[PDB]
């Protein structure tokens, strides 16, 4: 028998948790044929760290029963409770292998490639399940599903949900499908399509992306294009901003061991500044090297320390500086290196803040760190806005194109 536990979380400003499931059939990415809530996500220095796993079922929550509720109530519940949430929680008694709790089954992926092809071929086609089932399972479950989805009818997934969906719904849907090297690499095939049109998408992808994702990128983009992405990036930059989004590219950054180099720290600080701001001109190679090839905890300290010399600080001096797509890029690494989740908060932000909704920046944000830090982006999305990144969202976009952001972003604050 699984055990039940009692667990506070002090909202800070959120709880630092997203949920999947539901008596409405969402499932979730861990037992999907059982409808209860599930945690999916939990932050890791967050105000459920150490207290929720992912896979843990909700009971209870305030007093609340959390058994048979839909989806949507229980988002609402959550985020409105003021301050303080006592939560029951159901936990699978687990040894050594941790990720026994993710009991997702090859027929698992049959049902919902199943299911997913009922919702396709029904009449007025089944947004509403689509959007349900492909919004509450990883990104390697889909992988599962559209392979069973093919086995089954002989046709690719991505080609039905193509003809049975349209607008910023087939996007966001059509994205959630690629892995997240494919993804990445057709939307930098995408952004260089265009050739000087849409250096942003190049920019957010090449200077957000760690070493890891880079070489994965790298990989998939020459097995999909039979082409070296550095040729392409080459193809289609010029100058200073040629240079650092190659050196970029190349996710060959230093990785911070298990020493802080406080001398090294100071020492690069003063070079960034006697390159920039206290120079006529800019030494654009010396800032191409520093801020490319360390590793991102000692910039970190390296941007501080820089504050001391500079009556600027870093992202100021970048301004003073440097202009065009060379300041853009610089401007964005400089974000990713300080404060990533801030970064896409920001992003997000200035996507949906004004008249419409800069949608093509608003999927490609919730598709691809809906699996790496989107709870760390809602927390300073809320920190600094005073509103959930979820209300943002739900102003800005309608339909089941909205119910996906949503399901994305894992819940409100
Ligand atoms: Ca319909
Ligand atoms: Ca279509
Ligand atoms: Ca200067
Ligand atoms: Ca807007």
């Not at 989004?245 to 180099?261: H, P, T």
């Amino acid at each position: 028998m699984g055990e039940q536990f009692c667990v506070r979380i002090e909202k800070n400003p959120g709880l630092g948790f997203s949920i999947s499931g539901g008596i409405s059939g969402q499932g979730n990415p861990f037992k999907p044929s059982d409808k209860g809530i599930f945690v999916t996500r939990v932050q890791p220095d967050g105000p459920a760290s150490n207290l929720l796993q992912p896979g843990d079922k909700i009971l209870q929550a305030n007093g609340h029963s959390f058994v048979h509720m839909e989806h949507e109530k229980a988002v609402l519940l959550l985020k409105s409770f003021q301050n303080t949430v006592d939560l029951v929680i159901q936990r699978e008694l687990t040894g050594s292998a941790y990720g026994s709790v993710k009991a997702y089954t090859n027929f698992d992926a049959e049902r919902d490639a199943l299911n997913i092809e009922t919702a396709i071929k029904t009449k007025g086609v089944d947004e509403v399940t689509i959007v349900n089932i492909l919004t509450n399972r990883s990104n390697e479950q889909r992988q599962d599903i559209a392979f069973a989805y093919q086995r089954r009818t002989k046709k690719e997934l991505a080609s039905a949900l193509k003809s049975a969906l349209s607008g910023h719904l087939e996007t966001v849907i059509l994205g959630l499908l690629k892995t997240p090297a494919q993804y990445d690499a057709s939307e930098l095939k995408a952004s260089m399509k265009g050739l000087g049109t849409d250096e942003d998408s190049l920019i957010e992808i090449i200077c957000s992306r760690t070493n890891q994702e880079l070489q994965e990128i790298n990989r998939v983009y020459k097995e999909m294009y039979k082409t070296d992405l550095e040729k392409d990036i080459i193809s289609d930059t010029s100058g200073d901003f040629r240079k650092l989004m190659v050196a970029l590219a190349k996710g060959r950054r230093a990785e911070d061991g298990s020493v802080i180099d406080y001398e090294l720290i100071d020492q690069d600080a003063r070079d960034l500044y006697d390159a920039g701001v206290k120079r006529k001109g800019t030494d654009v190679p010396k800032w191409i090297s520093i801020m490319t090839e360390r590793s991102v905890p000692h910039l970190q300290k390296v941007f501080d320390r820089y504050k001391s010399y500079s009556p600027y600080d870093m992202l100021e001096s970048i301004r003073k500086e440097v202009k065009g797509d060379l300041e853009n890029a610089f401007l964005n690494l400089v974000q990713c290196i300080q404060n990533k989740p801030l970064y896409f908060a920001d992003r997000l932000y200035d996507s949906m803040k004004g008249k419409g909704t800069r949608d093509k920046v608003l999927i490609r944000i919730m598709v691809s760190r809906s699996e790496v830090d989107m709870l760390k982006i809602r927390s300073e999305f809320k920190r600094k806005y005073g509103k959930s990144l979820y209300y943002y969202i739900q102003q800005d976009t309608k339909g089941d194109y909205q119910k996906a952001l949503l399901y994305l972003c894992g819940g409100d604050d």
